[PDB]
Structures are given as structure tokens and as C-alpha cells.
């Protein structure tokens, strides 16, 4: 089996995964909408009671199975719980990231496209007035995505977008085909620094942004000024518990699969705690000092509310480009911004797509090459649904993430800590650890953590399930029909896996 070459490269791959566009975009938005500085209170809390424990747990389940030559949750869940239902419940941890990758790699391509489009100077140039600057970059984005001009639920992306996508894929395979050490880790050693460099440089430039409407200081102020009145709202406490899940990226089986390339007795307690610290430092410091300040700097603090309600997506592909088109030589900032996001995704997309490669390697005994190419073929195929069918993207994200984090996460907990046994698990977590997990985390892992996930499951099931189930168009069934067909397919490979093992 393959293994990590360096302790650093491990943390950098892990942090490479965890570090998102979400750090630079989703995280700052969630803050401003839910108390600003006050959002840190429920955020830090859920970071200790939920994010930190589960992190160790996925890491633990990973190494526990990874020693036994099994990186995927179909196998691992069978080892923690030797049941027929455990393999099935484990299929999700192979189904969840595959579905997400069916659109993430595509979204990742946009950045590369936009980066190229911004580098060569092929960008809209306005014209004064806010809508008279945003609309050119609002339409620029729609041409790339291929947003429908008719009632039809049919996207028609530009030929260039498609080409960049293939290129983007080709980039992913290029790193993936070189294994864990000479590929992901080797790249994580290059990407993570390159990422930090761009972040700071942007942050610096952003702080030097002065417009008639305001300054960057006004953005940091608005963002970090704590409105505690919103902490009374349960919705803030929920949006917090989820945001951490999203930022750390738990409940996708990726941490598990990654931690399955960790040797049997190498530390996972501190290693994970470090990668987790890197991601969150990146969010609050870097990410929360580029977008929101630059937005507030240009559109005043008056629109700082309206900007936040405009969704993170707009801020990154419409608002921030349109802002850069006005600054001194900002066509290069556009290139720097997008290329920053490109890597942020590229360090993650290679990570998530490894879970499938590992499955074919471990269970179906495929070479790394074949496991890589076939996985690329599956993701490339599915992506056409997201590329061409409208709102297919959102449907995939809704199910794979919305459910996949809340359901599979609480599944990882009960299987490893309640079924496999708390004590046997607690030792499996602390084992090899340079430091030891505090004794109090035993109660958090066993009672407090699943208490939160449980409350989270209930609130989610009431609010989000009746919405997508009726009010939506009929083409959502096509997306549903497809993603269901994937789970049924992975059920068949899991079946083929166990039938190949009884023979030998
Ligand atoms: C930067 N990260 C948060 C790591 C996850 C990125 N990501 C993702 C992003 C948004 C929502 C769900 C998921 C699911 C995990 C997963 C799995 C494979 C890939 Cl190719 C990306 C991917
Ligand atoms: Na993150
Ligand atoms: Na990343």
C-alpha cells in the first residue's frame, strides 16, 4: 500500500483539502449575516464540540482500516461493524464525494477559465452606477456557464469553458496518476505555499483600496463588529455547526480515505489538529479580509448588508471581478484572485477523487493508473448533467452535501464509537499521538457531539426537505434519477468486491 512521505506533506494535503473557496467566500458571508464578530461564539463552540472530535474520528477510522489495506467506508464500516447493513451504509461515503466531484471539478474549471480570461485581458470593460458595472460581469459569467435565455432548463456553456474543463480534468489526473507521495503530497508542498502567497498579496492590496464610498477598514469593521443580538437566534447556532462541517470538510469519507494512508502507529491527534488549525486560520485571517472588505471598500458599508445577502457565489464571480476592473491594473488582480481560487479547489478536487481510486485499488485490485482513468471517466461523464441540465448542480449539492454530511457523519460516529465500542475507539484515536486527547473529549465524542448532530438532523429535515420535494421543476427527477443510479451502481461494485474475495 502507498503511504505519506513526510509528516509535513500529510498536514499540507489535509489542509490542502480543507482549505476551500469556502474559506474565502462562504465563511465570510456566513459571519456577516449572523452576528459578524458575534458569529465567532457559536463558531468556536461547534469547532470544539463537533468539528474537532469528528476530525479525530475520521482520522482514526481511516488509519484503523488503512493499516488493513482498506481506505473506503464500505470496507471500514464492515470492520467496525461486521454487518451487511454496514457495507450499504458505507456506500454513501463512496457515493457522496463522487456526486460532489460531478460538479466541483466543473466549478473549479471556471476559475481556471476566468483566470485565463483575466490574464489575457479578455474581460468586460465598463461603462458611475452600481448596476451599470455589475451587469457586464453578470452577463460575462452567464456566457461562460451558459445560463438559459429561454424557459428551457438547458445550459449552453461556451466552447472555451468546456475546453478548460477538460484541461482542468487533465490537470487533476496528472497529479492523481502519481500516487499519494509523488503526487498529492508533492503537490501539496507546492500548492499550499503558492496559495498563502497569493492570499497575503491580495489582502495587502485589498487594504490599500480607497474609493469615494469607503475603505477596507470599513469592511473589516462591518465584518468583525459583533452583533450579539443574533446569537439568540437558533438559526445562527445551526448555521455555525454546519459551517464548520463544511470548512473542515467532514462527513464525505475523504478524511477517512486520506487517513488510511497514514501508517499504523503514526500520530493523528496532533497532525489533524494542525491541519484543522491551518484551515480555520486561513478562513478568519486571509479569507475574511479580502472579499468582504474589498466589497465594502468599493460599494460602501451601506450595501454591506445587500452584498452579503447576494450569496457568496456572486461575490466571487461577479462582484469581485467587477471591482477589480476598476482598480489600477486590476485585470491582474482578477487573474491573481481566480488563480488563488483555482488552487484552493485543485488541492481539494484531487483529494476527493482519491476515495474512488482507493476503492478500485483496494477492493477491486485495480492498478493506480486504471483506478485513476476510470474514476476520471465516471466524473467526466456525470459532469455533463451538471454542465447542460439546469439546476442539476444544485440538486446534486443538496443531496450529496445537505444529507451526506448530517446523515453519514452521525453514521461514522455511532459505528466507530457506539458499535465498535467507545474504549476500543478512544485508544484507537490516542494511539501513536505525540499528544494525548484530553480526557474530557471522551464525553464530548460520546454524548455532546452526537447530541448536536442529532438536533442538526431534525432541524434540517423539517426546513429543507419539503422545499425541494414539491416546489421544484420536474427535471430535478432526472438529476435524482441519475444520482440514485450511481448509488445502485456502487452497490453493485461493493457486491463485486466481496464476490471476488470469497474466490481467493
Ligand atoms: C475544499 N473542501 C471543502 C473539500 C471538499 C471539496 N468538495 C466539496 C465541496 C463542497 C461541498 C461538498 C464537497 C464534498 C467533498 C468533496 C469530494 C470530492 C471533491 Cl472533487 C470535492 C469535494
Ligand atoms: Na474550509
Ligand atoms: Na483546497
Amino acid at each position: 500500500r502507498e503511504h505519506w512521505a513526510t509528516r509535513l506533506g500529510l498536514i499540507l494535503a489535509m489542509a490542502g483539502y480543507a482549505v476551500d473557496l469556502g474559506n474565502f467566500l462562504r465563511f465570510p458571508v456566513q459571519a456577516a449575516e449572523n452576528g459578524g464578530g458575534a458569529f465567532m461564539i457559536p463558531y468556536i463552540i461547534a469547532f470544539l464540540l463537533v468539528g474537532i472530535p469528528l476530525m479525530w474520528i475520521e482520522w482514526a477510522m481511516g488509519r484503523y482500516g488503512g493499516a488493513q489495506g482498506h481506505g473506503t467506508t464500505p470496507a471500514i464500516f464492515y470492520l467496525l461493524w461486521r454487518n451487511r447493513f454496514a457495507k450499504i451504509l458505507g456506500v454513501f461515503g463512496l457515493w457522496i464525494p463522487l456526486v460532489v466531484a460531478s460538479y466541483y471539478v466543473y466549478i473549479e474549471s471556471w476559475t481556471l477559465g476566468f483566470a485565463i480570461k483575466f490574464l489575457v485581458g479578455l474581460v468586460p470593460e465598463p461603462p458611475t452606477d452600481p448596476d451599470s458595472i455589475l451587469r457586464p460581469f453578470k452577463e460575462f459569467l452567464y456566457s461562460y456557464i451558459g445560463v438559459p435565455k429561454g424557459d428551457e432548463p438547458i445550459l449552453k456553456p461556451s466552447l472555451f469553458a468546456y475546453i478548460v474543463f477538460l484541461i482542468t480534468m487533465f490537470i487533476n489526473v496528472s497529479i492523481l496518476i502519481r500516487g499519494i507521495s509523488k503526487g498529492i503530497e508533492r503537490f501539496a508542498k507546492i500548492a499550499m505555499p503558492t496559495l498563502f502567497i497569493l492570499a497575503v498579496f491580495l489582502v495587502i492590496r485589498v487594504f490599500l483600496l480607497e474609493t469615494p464610498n469607503g475603505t477596507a477598514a470599513d469592511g473589516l469593521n462591518f465584518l468583525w463588529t459583533p452583533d450579539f443580538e443574533k446569537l439568540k437566534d437558533p438559526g445562527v447556532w445551526i448555521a455555525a455547526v454546519g459551517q464548520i462541517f463544511f470548512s473542515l470538510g467532514l462527513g464525505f469519507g475523504v478524511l477517512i480515505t486520506f487517513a488510511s494512508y497514514v501508517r499504523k502507529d503514526q500520530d493523528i491527534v496532533l497532525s489533524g489538529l494542525t491541519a484543522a488549525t491551518l484551515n480555520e486560520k486561513a478562513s478568519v485571517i486571509l479569507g475574511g479580509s479580502i472579499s468582504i472588505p474589498a466589497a465594502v471598500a468599493f460599494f460602501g458599508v451601506a450595501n454591506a448588508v445587500a452584498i452579503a445577502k447576494a450569496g457568496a457565489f456572486n461575490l466571487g464571480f461577479i462582484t469581485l471581478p467587477a471591482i477589480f476592473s476598476q482598480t489600477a491594473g486590476g485585470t491582474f488582480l482578477g487573474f491573481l484572485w481566480f488563480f488563488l481560487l483555482f488552487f484552493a479547489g485543485l488541492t481539494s478536487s484531487i483529494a476527493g477523487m482519491q476515495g474512488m481510486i482507493a476503492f478500485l485499488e483496494d477492493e477491486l485490485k485495480l492498478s493506480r493508473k486504471h483506478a485513476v482513468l476510470w474514476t476520471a471517466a465516471i466524473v467526466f461523464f456525470s459532469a455533463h448533467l451538471v454542465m447542460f441540465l439546469n439546476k442539476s448542480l444544485d440538486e446534486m449539492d443538496f443531496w450529496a452535501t445537505g444529507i451526506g454530511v448530517v446523515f453519514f457523519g452521525l453514521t461514522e460516529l455511532i459505528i466507530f464509537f457506539w458499535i465498535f465500542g467507545a474504549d476500543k475507539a478512544w485508544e484507537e484515536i490516542n494511539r501513536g499521538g505525540i499528544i494525548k486527547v484530553p480526557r474530557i473529549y471522551y464525553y464530548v465524542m460520546r454524548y455532546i457531539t452526537p447530541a448536536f448532530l442529532a438536533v442538526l438532523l431534525v432541524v434540517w429535515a423539517r426546513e429543507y426537505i419539503p422545499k425541494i420535494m414539491e416546489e421544484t421543476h420536474w427535471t430535478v427527477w432526472i438529476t435524482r434519477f441519475y444520482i440514485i443510479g450511481l448509488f445502485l451502481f456502487l452497490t453493485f461494485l461493493v457486491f463485486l468486491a466481496e464476490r471476488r474475495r470469497n474466490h481467493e
Side-chain angles (χ1 to χ4, degrees), residues 18-20 22-23 246-249 279 283:
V19 164
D20 23 354
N23 295 28
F246 250 26
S247 188
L248 297 182
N279 162 77
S283 294

Side-chain angles (χ1 to χ4, degrees), residues 17-20 97 100-101 103-105 246 252 348-349 352-353 397 401:
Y17 160 84
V19 164
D20 23 354
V100 182
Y103 60 80
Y104 200 79
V105 177
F246 250 26
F252 298 114
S348 324
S349 48
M353 286 201 286
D397 187 274
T401 69

Side-chain angles (χ1 to χ4, degrees), residues 33-104:
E33 282 197 6
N34 306 284
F39 182 78
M40 293 305 104
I41 299 299
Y43 190 82
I44 294 164
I45 287 178
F47 175 80
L48 309 170
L49 291 181
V50 179
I52 286 308
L54 262 174
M55 172 199 65
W56 281 327
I57 297 184
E58 292 201 38
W59 277 69
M61 296 182 293
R63 181 183 61 183
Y64 174 77
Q68 311 184 43
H70 290 327
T72 52
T73 68
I76 294 188
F77 282 11
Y78 191 59
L79 305 181
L80 303 176
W81 183 24
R82 216 154 186 269
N83 197 305
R84 328 297 153 185
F85 198 20
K87 289 188 183 180
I88 303 180
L89 286 185
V91 178
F92 290 94
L94 190 63
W95 173 80
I96 298 159
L98 187 51
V99 172
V100 182
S102 296
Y103 60 80
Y104 200 79

Side-chain angles (χ1 to χ4, degrees), residues 299-338:
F299 293 103
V301 81
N303 306 272
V305 176
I307 293 176
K309 293 182 179 299
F313 189 77
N314 299 20
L315 184 66
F317 289 76
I318 301 177
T319 312
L320 256 57
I323 283 184
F324 294 156
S325 68
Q326 306 300 281
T327 68
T331 192
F332 196 85
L333 280 185
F335 161 74
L336 288 187
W337 167 248
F338 284 111

Side-chain angles (χ1 to χ4, degrees), residues 385-447:
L385 198 61
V386 175
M387 286 196 294
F388 291 82
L389 187 66
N390 191 24
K391 295 306 174 187
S392 183
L393 182 152
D394 313 70
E395 192 73 354
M396 296 197 185
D397 187 274
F398 170 79
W399 295 102
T401 69
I403 294 210
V405 299
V406 171
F407 173 78
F408 197 82
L410 192 60
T411 302
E412 289 172 326
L413 241 175
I414 302 178
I415 293 188
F416 182 64
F417 231 65
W418 283 95
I419 298 180
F420 179 77
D423 295 31
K424 303 173 64 62
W426 176 264
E427 303 304 319
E428 173 55 31
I429 299 181
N430 293 265
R431 178 168 59 92
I434 298 181
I435 67 176
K436 299 305 180 182
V437 183
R439 199 168 186 84
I440 196 68
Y441 262 89
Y442 185 87
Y443 307 103
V444 178
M445 286 183 181
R446 199 186 184 189
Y447 296 99

Side-chain angles (χ1 to χ4, degrees), residues 239-257:
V241 177
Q243 172 50 56
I244 306 213
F245 225 115
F246 250 26
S247 188
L248 297 182
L250 311 148
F252 298 114
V254 192
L255 284 185
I256 296 189
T257 321

Side-chain angles (χ1 to χ4, degrees), residues 139-263 265-461:
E139 294 171 358
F140 179 70
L141 173 55
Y142 291 3
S143 299
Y144 191 95
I145 301 313
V147 176
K149 291 167 261 60
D151 277 23
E152 309 287 88
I154 301 305
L155 305 162
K156 196 54 189 176
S158 60
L159 172 55
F160 179 68
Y162 191 90
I163 288 185
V164 174
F165 174 63
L166 266 172
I167 293 169
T168 308
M169 276 295 305
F170 177 81
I171 291 177
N172 271 263
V173 173
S174 311
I175 315 178
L176 287 170
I177 198 172
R178 282 156 174 78
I180 302 292
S181 57
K182 300 178 181 298
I184 303 180
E185 170 182 352
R186 174 182 177 270
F187 186 78
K189 287 184 174 179
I190 303 181
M192 299 313 291
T194 307
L195 205 62
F196 181 79
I197 296 175
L198 298 165
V200 175
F201 186 87
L202 284 169
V203 167
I204 292 176
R205 204 289 183 279
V206 169
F207 289 173
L208 301 177
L209 288 184
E210 292 186 343
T211 74
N213 289 311
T215 58
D218 310 353
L220 294 177
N221 173 82
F222 163 80
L223 185 59
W224 294 119
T225 308
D227 176 25
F228 298 95
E229 187 77 304
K230 300 208 64 177
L231 299 184
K232 297 180 172 181
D233 196 326
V236 169
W237 287 90
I238 270 64
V241 177
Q243 172 50 56
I244 306 213
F245 225 115
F246 250 26
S247 188
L248 297 182
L250 311 148
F252 298 114
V254 192
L255 284 185
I256 296 189
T257 321
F258 253 20
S260 71
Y261 290 99
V262 173
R263 296 183 178 269
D265 298 327
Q266 180 178 331
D267 159 71
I268 65 172
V269 177
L270 187 63
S271 305
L273 186 51
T274 306
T277 313
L278 279 179
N279 162 77
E280 301 296 345
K281 281 178 174 175
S283 294
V284 293
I285 299 305
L286 310 174
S289 310
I290 301 158
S291 63
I292 303 306
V296 176
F298 201 94
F299 293 103
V301 81
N303 306 272
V305 176
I307 293 176
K309 293 182 179 299
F313 189 77
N314 299 20
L315 184 66
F317 289 76
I318 301 177
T319 312
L320 256 57
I323 283 184
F324 294 156
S325 68
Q326 306 300 281
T327 68
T331 192
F332 196 85
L333 280 185
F335 161 74
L336 288 187
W337 167 248
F338 284 111
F339 171 61
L340 169 72
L341 295 190
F342 173 77
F343 273 4
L346 181 53
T347 32
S348 324
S349 48
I350 58 173
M353 286 201 286
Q354 180 69 31
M356 196 61 192
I357 300 167
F359 179 86
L360 304 176
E361 288 168 330
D362 305 349
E363 331 301 340
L364 288 183
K365 305 300 181 187
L366 253 56
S367 64
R368 187 171 59 244
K369 174 182 73 174
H370 299 153
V372 166
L373 297 189
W374 276 117
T375 291
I378 290 178
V379 177
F380 177 55
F381 185 86
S382 323
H384 288 69
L385 198 61
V386 175
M387 286 196 294
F388 291 82
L389 187 66
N390 191 24
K391 295 306 174 187
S392 183
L393 182 152
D394 313 70
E395 192 73 354
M396 296 197 185
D397 187 274
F398 170 79
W399 295 102
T401 69
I403 294 210
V405 299
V406 171
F407 173 78
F408 197 82
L410 192 60
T411 302
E412 289 172 326
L413 241 175
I414 302 178
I415 293 188
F416 182 64
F417 231 65
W418 283 95
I419 298 180
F420 179 77
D423 295 31
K424 303 173 64 62
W426 176 264
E427 303 304 319
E428 173 55 31
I429 299 181
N430 293 265
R431 178 168 59 92
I434 298 181
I435 67 176
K436 299 305 180 182
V437 183
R439 199 168 186 84
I440 196 68
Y441 262 89
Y442 185 87
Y443 307 103
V444 178
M445 286 183 181
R446 199 186 184 189
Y447 296 99
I448 309 306
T449 310
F452 273 81
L453 303 196
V455 175
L456 215 70
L457 176 136
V458 174
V459 177
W460 182 96

